[PDB]
Amino acid sequence: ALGITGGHCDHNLLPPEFNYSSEGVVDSPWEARKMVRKNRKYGADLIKFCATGGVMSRNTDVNAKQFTLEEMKAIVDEAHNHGMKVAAHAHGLIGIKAAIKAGVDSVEHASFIDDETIDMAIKNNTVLSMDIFVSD
Amino acid sequence: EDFLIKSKGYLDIQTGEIIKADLLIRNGKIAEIGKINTKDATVISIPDLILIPGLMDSHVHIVGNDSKGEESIADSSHMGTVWGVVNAEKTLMAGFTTVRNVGAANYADVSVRDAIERGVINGPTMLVSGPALGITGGHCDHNLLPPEFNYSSEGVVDSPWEARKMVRKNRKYGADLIKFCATGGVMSRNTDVNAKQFTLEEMKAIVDEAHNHGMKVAAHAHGLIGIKAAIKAGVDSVEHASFIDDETIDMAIKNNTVLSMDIFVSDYILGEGAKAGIREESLNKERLVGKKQRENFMNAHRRGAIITFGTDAGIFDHGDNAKQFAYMVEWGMTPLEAIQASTIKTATLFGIENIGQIKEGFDADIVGVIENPLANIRTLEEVAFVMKEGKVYKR
Amino acid sequence: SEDFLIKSKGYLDIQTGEIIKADLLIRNGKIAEIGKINTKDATVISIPDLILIPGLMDSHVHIVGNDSKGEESIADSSHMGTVWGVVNAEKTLMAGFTTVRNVGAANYADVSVRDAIERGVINGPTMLVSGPALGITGGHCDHNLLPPEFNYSSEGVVDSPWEARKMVRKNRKYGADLIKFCATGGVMSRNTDVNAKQFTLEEMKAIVDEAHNHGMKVAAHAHGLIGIKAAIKAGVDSVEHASFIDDETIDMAIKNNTVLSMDIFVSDYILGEGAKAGIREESLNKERLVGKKQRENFMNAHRRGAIITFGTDAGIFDHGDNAKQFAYMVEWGMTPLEAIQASTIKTATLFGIENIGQIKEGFDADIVGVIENPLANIRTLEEVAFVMKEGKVYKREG
Amino acid sequence: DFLIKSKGYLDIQTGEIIKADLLIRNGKIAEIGKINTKDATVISIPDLILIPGLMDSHVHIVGNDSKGEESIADSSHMGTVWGVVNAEKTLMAGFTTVRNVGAANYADVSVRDAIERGVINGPTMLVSGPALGITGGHCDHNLLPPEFNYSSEGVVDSPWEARKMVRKNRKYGADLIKFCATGGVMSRNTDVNAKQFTLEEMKAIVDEAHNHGMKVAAHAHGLIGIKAAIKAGVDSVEHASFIDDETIDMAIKNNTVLSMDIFVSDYILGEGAKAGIREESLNKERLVGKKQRENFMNAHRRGAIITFGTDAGIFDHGDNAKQFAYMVEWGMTPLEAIQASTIKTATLFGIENIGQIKEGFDADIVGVIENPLANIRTLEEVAFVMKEGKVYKR
């Protein structure tokens, strides 16, 4: 999964002395581009990125957008260029909005989606992939 | 644990009026204002001491090496953390309950903040910045080594995406807050104080990314072009702000850019600091900056700009933060407005609500003082009672 | 000028056992005179019912390290270990320990805390520090808590004689007083055989020769017998723990002036109030192997005539509670006088420091004052009432 | 609890098969004798002879078994997926404790621990980590151009480097140390009759592993490397292909086991030739194969300990018992061949309480149709597998 430094799909479990980032951590449009290429190269069928923070990660904010829209658009263009679909992890609303705008194929979780951006997903044929059991 | 505080009176920091009433404290918050019934737990008889909210400093460097001389040259970064423990206690006993740390290395600032937060040690509630962000060779670079070492400091960033990433890295590792340098400085080697550092594009990228995570942004800036650009980039405070003029005071007003103007510390640097360790290149830049800053501090206050209590403690001794109160009133603030700048005005800037007022529901940060501070403000230099978050630290 | 006259119930002579009624003159951080002193300018410590002994010592502490627990503590930096170190140094002082041997830490932050004590930045005992402990790859003072993908060895991992040479030199360069190595496996580490020697003798003899070349002392961690034998043969100044020492190698230790720093309290913490408090079950099973056998061998060590010092492995248990071992030391077969001797003059000789560990003329003013007589009840060392270090008073109750 | 009613069990010490019943509680043989009393449940077998669970002292369970064009850029994780398959295949063939003798990335220890924890089915593995070797050796990867400068994990080239890698293998969970002491068949660019490692390097490995209580196996075809492995003091020499009269006697005196694989040559030169094995390897097999099982016969005759080791991985996992026929063919009694795969291996592995149907020993029990002392080829199709008191095959 592609993420920002310290994102949901980074690994924020080590002291800063280790300087660990996970395999898919990317922090520019062209880095993000390259990671889509690297995933395709080694055989991936789709691209996942993290667009907000999440529940299971340390030190992430669920309502904070992760990635600029510029980075998000780069991930989506490059993946669609190779005929890959794009899923985007997004709990908070500003992330959901931004993922849809970038042109993602599915938004994962989609937890705080409002009326106006439900309709954004309808209009763009964006799918909501929503895990409503797992909270229990 | 419950506390009834028997005061000479509390300052109402909104109105000015001091109010003779009692305060009930339960679990780190002010419960009651008025005359209170008293059934369970303990009384603090104070009665000679007029009560004010816990004070704030918006520009400190609590963590750093304060050992000096020949013995201290090969000292590891951990000596700076030892001193961090010391200076935090010293800052709390001076009646400062919530501060904004504005540069450290190695996330030792978050180490000292969290230890206070866990009750491992005593100190103020630190808002910490992590490594400050600079251009190669800037003010918050370290320009003290030969080119053969090729040493750059932790926050050195040189493109918008590099800067984006360091904001993220600082968020990852605990920072509350991004500080960056937008001009050259006084205390650094090889920096022009009137030169802009960072492109506008670099600056905007820092701000955009930090605000995206709900982090506030502070910019170090003396020179005018730097101040303008920082304001234009959309920062939450300009630090120092030394050569601010009529037009860009106005730019700051329309944007809600706080000015964090350290008007004491020039007198320490040009006075006691000349033999205390401070380089001659640094003293020459302080002559350029010092007088003109408080001239412009007076102008900014007159024109209506928001100014908060930041001192650059760490240059001068921690504990002596309160010495700036007298300077603040000397250069145009009323005594009320000087205390407002370390209570209600910092609290907005810090982004923390429920501090800095003696109001019901607010956090029990309270400092007891000898005289009437609206008459003599230099009482804040000699405090007799410190409560932070319900617990009593000084009596 | 700024001198102290201490008026007390008595002072212990640590060579004899005698409690002597005398006053003490303190100048320039030293005990100047003992007896009746004519003075009119010196300020008087009136401390009339307190018995005085010299400042206590610990030959095995870990003052610096993170003592924060739970889920919030996980990505904490190394500087949180230094913040805790400050707290723990103060806590060790207030329990009447005035010179200690800090026997393993990371990043030379042990030398920082030490130096900041030396400079009077913070209150604490005089630490003698090791630096990073030298270990083999995957040894007890390696860190085996990470997947092989990380390929993390800790700071002091060495695997050849000339590598071990180089780490002794590096430790010294960054300010260390002594060298600790692990010679066997250990209780508190993951995947270490307590009964297996770690290091070759060649590597052990290289560590020792270099450390002694620079006038540094060597401690060796060794539970298992083969590693005790090898440490002694290499020429170490102390074997730490020494848990499965036998008759023949007690005799070796006597012969070569090898000290035995035997932490005999701490097994009651780990199995008791430590199994509840987050010690892993792999460690506890190794603790069951060690603890009772160490105390039996502690008794046999003393009676056969080996030098034992007072080490606790504090840091495992709470700093400040070091003196709980004193009870455990009369239990397992020292006289109360020998117990304090182990924490004063016997430690001083191990430490290589002259002019501490006695209330004597010319010696440093490291002086602990106590409520009951410690030769009658040793367990009042667990609640001291007066602490003086280097002329300065740090604890006084009444 | 379990009660096993049986045609009889092999007493592997005496050779005489004993008609009795076996009581299994807590994964051990509790009672041998006549019982059918109390607790839990009978196992209705009747017609099967019982033997102690079979052991292989030279396997390679983890590794990619996919072939051809698809498999070329496969990650190391494919070899781990295959390890899960190959563990079951080994266990269902009646092999209950095995020695895995060289994998990469510590995937062997993973596969082991997964079996131990009950995540997956398989035998108890003792694992080596990466095999130690010189640069360019048999257990170096000799298949990439110079510009890559690739060397595999266990490449060491000094005594102290070797020491360190033993320590690294221990650290990440290895039970034993394999090293390569000559060149090999299945590698590119190795001479089978040339020693690899100095004696001083070999002694450094042996001394360091024995210090941690780890057994040492040394790969050796050529004679001069077999000699030097024994003098180093290894616990086994694998293959042992060109061992002579004089240094068989060295192996008897020093109690060095010879883990000789005498089946696999016939796979390599037959079905393996068209399976994608290189001509350089096939040529080196023709140097080794015939003379190995000749020297097997001489080693057994002179009094040397030989264990059952097969080099499975080359052939398909689960076909391991095909070697048993070859071992009687080349000089052993059928008892001696099962002795080689039970009590001889248990001593080599350093594990007490397996390899025997005796009281207090672990419940590793395999049921077979015919008498194995009659025809040994019954072990090629076992009917009943029990490992640690759990029944895996019926």
Ligand SMILES: NC(=[NH2+])NCCC[C@H](N)C(=O)O
């Ligand atoms: N309410 C929920 N769907 N919770 C589960 C969210 C799981 C997701 N991987 C996350 O950590 O954000």
Ligand SMILES: NC(=[NH2+])NCCC[C@H](N)C(=O)O
């Ligand atoms: N007039 C002043 N505020 N002087 C102090 C400036 C301190 C600042 N950190 C700098 O070096 O630039």
Ligand SMILES: NC(=[NH2+])NCCC[C@H](N)C(=O)O
């Ligand atoms: N019984 C004892 N001495 N227990 C404490 C042992 C502490 C030592 N660091 C170890 O893990 O080996």
Ligand SMILES: NC(=[NH2+])NCCC[C@H](N)C(=O)O
């Ligand atoms: N005759 C034999 N045992 N042949 C098989 C040898 C296989 C061994 N792994 C090697 O490459 O050398």
